[PDB]
Write a protein that binds this DNA or RNA. Sequence first.
DNA 1: AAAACGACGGCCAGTGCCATAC
DNA 2: GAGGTATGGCACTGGCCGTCGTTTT
DNA 3: AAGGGCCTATAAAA
DNA 4: TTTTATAGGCCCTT
Lengths: 367, 369, 1012
Amino acid sequence: EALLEICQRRHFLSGSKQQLSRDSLLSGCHPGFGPLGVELRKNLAAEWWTSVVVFREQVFPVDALHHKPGPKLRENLLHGALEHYVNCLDLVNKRLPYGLAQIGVCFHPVFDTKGVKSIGEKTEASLVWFTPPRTSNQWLDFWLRHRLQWWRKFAMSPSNFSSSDCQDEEGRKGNKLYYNFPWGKELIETLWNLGDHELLHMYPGNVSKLHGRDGRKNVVPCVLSVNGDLDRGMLAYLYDSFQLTENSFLHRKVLKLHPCLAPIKVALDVGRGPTLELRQVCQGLFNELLENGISVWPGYLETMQSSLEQLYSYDEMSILFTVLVTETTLENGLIHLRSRDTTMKEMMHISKLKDFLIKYISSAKNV
Amino acid sequence: EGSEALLEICQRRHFLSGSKQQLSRDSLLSGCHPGFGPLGVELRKNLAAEWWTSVVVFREQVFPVDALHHKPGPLRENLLHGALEHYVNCLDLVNKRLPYGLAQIGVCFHPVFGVKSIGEKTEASLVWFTPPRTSNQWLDFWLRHRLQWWRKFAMSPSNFSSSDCQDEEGRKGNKLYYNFPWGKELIETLWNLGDHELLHMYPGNVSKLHGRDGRKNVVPCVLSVNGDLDRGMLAYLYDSFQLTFTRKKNLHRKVLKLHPCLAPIKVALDVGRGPTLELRQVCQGLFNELLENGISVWPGYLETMQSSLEQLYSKYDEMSILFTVLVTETTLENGLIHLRSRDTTMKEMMHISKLKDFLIKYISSAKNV
Amino acid sequence: QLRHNPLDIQMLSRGLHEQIFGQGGEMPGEAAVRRSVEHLQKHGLWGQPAVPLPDVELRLPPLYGDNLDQHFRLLAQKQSLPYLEAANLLLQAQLPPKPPAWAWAEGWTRYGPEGEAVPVAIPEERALVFAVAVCLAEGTCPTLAVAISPSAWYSWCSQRLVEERYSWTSQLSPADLIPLEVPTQEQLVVGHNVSFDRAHIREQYLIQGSRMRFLDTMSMHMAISGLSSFQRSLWIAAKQGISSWDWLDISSVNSLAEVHRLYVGGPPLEKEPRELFVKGTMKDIRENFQDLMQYCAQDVWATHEVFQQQLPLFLERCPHPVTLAGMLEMGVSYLPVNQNWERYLAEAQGTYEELQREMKKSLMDLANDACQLLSGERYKEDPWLWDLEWDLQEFKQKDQEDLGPCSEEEEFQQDVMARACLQKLKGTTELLPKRPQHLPGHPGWYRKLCPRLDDPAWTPGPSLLSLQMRVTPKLMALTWDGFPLHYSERHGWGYLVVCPYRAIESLYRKHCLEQARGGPKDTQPSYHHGNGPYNDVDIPGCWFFKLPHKDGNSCNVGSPFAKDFLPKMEDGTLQAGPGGASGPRALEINKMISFWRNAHKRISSQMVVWLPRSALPRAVIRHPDYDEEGLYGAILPQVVTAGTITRAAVEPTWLTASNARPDRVGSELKAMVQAPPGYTLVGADVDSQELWIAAVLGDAHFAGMHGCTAFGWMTLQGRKSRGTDLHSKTATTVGISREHAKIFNYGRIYGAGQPFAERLLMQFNHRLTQQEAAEKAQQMYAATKGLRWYRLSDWLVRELNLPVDRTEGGWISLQDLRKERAWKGGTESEMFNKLESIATSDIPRTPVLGCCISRALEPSAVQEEFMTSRVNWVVQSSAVDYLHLMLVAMKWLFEEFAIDGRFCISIHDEVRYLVREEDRYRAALALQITNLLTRCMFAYKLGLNDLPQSVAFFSAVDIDRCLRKEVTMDCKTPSNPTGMERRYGIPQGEALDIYQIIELTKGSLEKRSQPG
DNA sequence: AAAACGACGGCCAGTGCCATAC
DNA sequence: GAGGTATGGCACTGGCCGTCGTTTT
DNA sequence: AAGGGCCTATAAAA
DNA sequence: TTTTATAGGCCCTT
Ligand SMILES: Nc1ccn([C@H]2C[C@H](O)[C@@H](COP(=O)(O)OP(=O)(O)OP(=O)(O)O)O2)c(=O)n1
């Protein structure tokens, strides 16, 4: 689609036109992400971390190795969390319901007839939740609910994010999450009730080490594995931001990425006038916004060699607001502010700009 | 020695995972350690965040980049090659304004002497493309800045040292070391690599690689800054434990004086004796408020009362927690809570409404000191 | 062309001696030669080998008048004639009444006789009385100014005052400054501290020379009725509420109000009560525009009346034209800078901050540990921390099983319940005291060390800590020779609520293991030795001793971390409690950052004005070194032309700017003054200026020969390879090191006495017991400046007819009846006698230019009161006359031979000019010629025509691109580690001898004659 | 509910000591 | 009869005025 | 080693 | 948005 071309042009995705394809993107063998894509994925991972780890008192970070020493590569983050389970049980004084969360790259085989074999990478976010079996399935539903809401939290079309129920061979419940890409539904997150077979197999003998406290009685924990693909989630959000044509009333195109997820919040540029004065004012505003944690695209370093319409068509970069500083700003301090969502142009004083952006981001977060 | 007690504290306080034998100096330095505990992971996350804020966020010409872990694509040793590949594509970001950087933090794999194993080190790299006329100047700039960054969070900044070194091909470079109790260990390397690798990467038309040095077009010289964040975390852990004496040894308090920006847990919250329901309600409210403002809190109030206040203080000091917050029956009446600082071990009264603002101000100001 | 003095001293070349009108001079006598040779033999300084100097022959430029004195008089009169004419126009000027209301119009406005305000581009006037006002809050851009000219008033307003604008340029340009200079005829601007006003007129920042000069009422006030800093304290204390105070009613401090009181008198002038420019904002200035303009006009009027009174007095009191010409030349001084300056500032500040933070962290950590001593009450057992306040206060007053997950509504309700429950605590917060407490649960000293929370610049922990605080030596547990330190109120730092003397004794025993009134109760002796009072402070264990001080037992040590205690730290007498290198590192950091801590508020705030490409000359533009992306600008140092009683220049920043030092953070300050492309700095410092002035005065007083006295001989022909040099001879005669002899001589020559020498001897060798050392000092003095002989100067012969004692001179006899002081045989006695004669004359005047001393230092006002001040003033004002002579001669040579140059800076000894690269060598030759002419003028005014070849020419002129003591210095500093060359494209200059210069320039200053 | 008083703290001038230059 | 002439900063101390808590008819 | 050919990209503009 | 002007850069001229 044209969205892939825009991502190629606006440095969301790296590589050539042939290197970027539906099959290549889904397989994970694409050359890599552009800086904007890296920032979007970083924001998505931060949002995942804030909604899972700091959300619950019982969830801890964990570091798992990538190579699994012994003469292979990593496929999932479950093994590392299971390895750290016994050590981290002492962290909670064996209070059984607790989680280990980790975000990292896992590798899977990929190959095509056109042969040999290649290796694909997927950045996954994993939560391993050790819970008493009596409530284990209940907790599964809980996490399912939460995960679904999280996917719907930043989505323009949450109906594209769907949940399905599935059962194991031996009757273990689980849930799958899908996003409806234009060609069909694709799996983006998996929740499984794994019982305690992997954990027991990891410690043959000394099962007393794995006991966790649950109402003054000791039981071997049930393991819930939640695994989400942040790469495919970022791709899904990019496709969700490309809601057909642009706003207002040439059929140009805008990516209405969520304010919390948009890699760049505001773009700063100069008008016509004294270059030194305008660049000084823009540098000051840029430093102010960075010191206040607002990502800024420094367009004033290129002056305004391009036209205003092409400059706005930032919209392909999913920038929330565009700020233009002119010689008028040197007199009264008023700058031109264009919104991405509404395409409305406004006059605003610089003093209020940082506060307005912070309040806008905060309200977008709380909605 | 005090190194054994520091390792015992790290193992006990879940800074480092694995057994005592698995945490040998060779195992830790080689990168073949089993892995980090949650506190170690959080400390490394804070260190990487500070690196990103001091390299990426406050520079217009430095951009994030993701490099794959596997070289062939038919393993990774350093992050330089991916940035070198992305150089031409990312040149469009600055309209070929030559001095610009690509920064990345990621795990690299290094073979070591089964008979031979593989160690992992999460390293942070900045690849700085600069006009050749200013290459050495930029090298000095980055050397100074990186050394200052390492000394910024250090209790004994003199342990972080810089050395000048020469390439076998005659290329200048700088190395950074931390003085562990056993000697100096390399933690960061800055090299002026020229453009030979870049030219070899793009055979044929060299005009594709040209960047604007003001009004001139020149093939950039590549500056590679690569720091070991695992070894940096280990260095800061060793730096928090004062190995020094006299009255200091008379006090002999086991505390990890980690920098506020690097400390994995900022605040510890616990209840006293009294009506449990109201105290649990107020503590849950305060905990949610503090988390909502991005301040890490250790929920000690969820555990029952089995240790004394002194035991809690020693446990939190070994965890390098900046402040301890106590909610008593007094808080239900007048709202005052007890705040104990890690640095001075002194207790103070503070009202709950002011606590979040004070903590945020403390964390923000710690950088500005 | 080789001449020798009758004392066998290499003289000026016979070719050049006749060109300085040496032919037809006086012939030295024979009895004087006999006496001088006998004196040299008595001092053992006669018959020494002489190394011949290669004589210099070159066609000197034309010399006007009969003698050199008339030459300098003619040159200075020509240079200062137009400005004297303009000053007379101001003097004999009847001014109209100032307008009833001020313009409030951008730019300059001229007020007609009826008060009408007609806008003008610039005041079309040749002489003006000037006063510039700036809004300090807004930076350094001038806001408004007022000017008085003969029959005209002018007022200038800034666009930043008249126009309300959100943003103005942070980096000033000449367009922001105010215009005064008339384009192509020469102007004079008069003001009180006129340098500040000059720093705000645009045309003065151009690289090309400006015909406009400036006269400062402060400088003339110091010339006529000035006082020393000690005299300033005395005057201020007397007017607020030494035996003779007759000088009070004739001198005042340099403030414009009291200058108006002294010279004009009448109604007092009232200052601005709110100080809106200094403290208020631009809005306050706008709201009080008329009042502030009226105050500025009042300042202009007061300065005008003061100048009217001063100019006749100054011209009468400094009758030589060279003084006025040199003051005019010093008025305009130019410091070229580029963008690198800014970087320097940032770098310096950054370095400073880092070096500070480290230090503070160390100190802060100590404090964070000391609080633990309150837990065990062990602070009273601490040999250092028992003196502190450890008070504290209080605040003010009047297991289950797994329940599983929760419903979405359930967790929603739980979260909202928690938030609502937490809001109640904030509601309670608003009921407790309005004034918060500052660290109630912390000790008193730690509460003092921490910034208050409401402080806008707040940092966590005891960030107020510094090495200079009294608590800091206690926190580091500083130990002096096994002794804990202590602070006595009357006597500073020494080495020893109940004092833990048992702990102190245990600590001393541990230190010994590591390796005097005798009351055992309370105050105790030491069986150890040292200085200071002992038993004034009462301690239960009180082997108390003051720390040694470089300024004697009377003085006290204010901080153990002073730069002179680093050698004691390295010795090991002074040690740190934690041990290792914490103490040495702290003292190293203090040494590195002391200069910047003192001078950053000045160096950073220094005013730069950046010239645009249009203002840049074509020579600079068409040059390879011209970087179009770079910035080129200037700093005009705000020099008070005569800021001391000695009429020496005073500038807060650049006359005290430290030279490059490897440890001082900002020491590359003078190196940061870099010439623009196409220009270089040609400078030179006078070789032992004060020493040679003193020596030549002594030689002229003793005989008609050069080097006739022993001190003059030593100064002229000292050599470090063998003896016969001054410092080595002093060391040989006294018995101590040559460096100690040098410091002794340089301390003495400034009018010193017995206590200085005794203190230095005791500090150097404590092994020499007090009185013995004193005797040593006395002998030193008997060798340098012979013993005083009173010679009936208390009548005295009538009292002598008792008869008692013999001889026609006194023996410092004391009569104790209660009913011309000279010196004796010594190397420096003749010059001391000459200086005392000049000081004690009825109207002390400088021997060369005839400039008088202040009316507050005249003997008729200060009889036998300020003697050291006057004897030092003689030499220092002679040095100022030397500087004026050099400036006049250099200006004459430049304007005569079309050398494209400008006066850059003068720091007492040093003079540096900004010349073109083409004419740098001609400028160096001109500098050599000027030095020769000034030395010969000094010699002639004293009475001797010939001049020694040793001091005839400059040792070496420095052609460089920046201000450095030596052209070879790379200026490695903590803030400039990469070095000058590697940081900025500034290469090393070159030092040229007189022979090198003449070989390069063919001995001519003409562009046509210069080789190519 | 209005009036006297004591305690705590901030602002500015004075003093002592140290750091630069020539 | 005094090491001199300048510059300036920082730490410490004391005097004065505003505010707040406490105490009287 | 210079200055004088060739295309040739740049940036505010008549 | 050129077009002619401005410094870059590279091939050919004593
Ligand atoms: N670029 C410079 C730097 C310095 N000087 C001179 C001026 C000083 O007077 C002299 C230093 O003189 P000392 O006091 O150090 O004496 P000397 O070392 O020259 O004398 P002696 O040979 O007796 O040791 O350096 C100079 O002419 N040009």
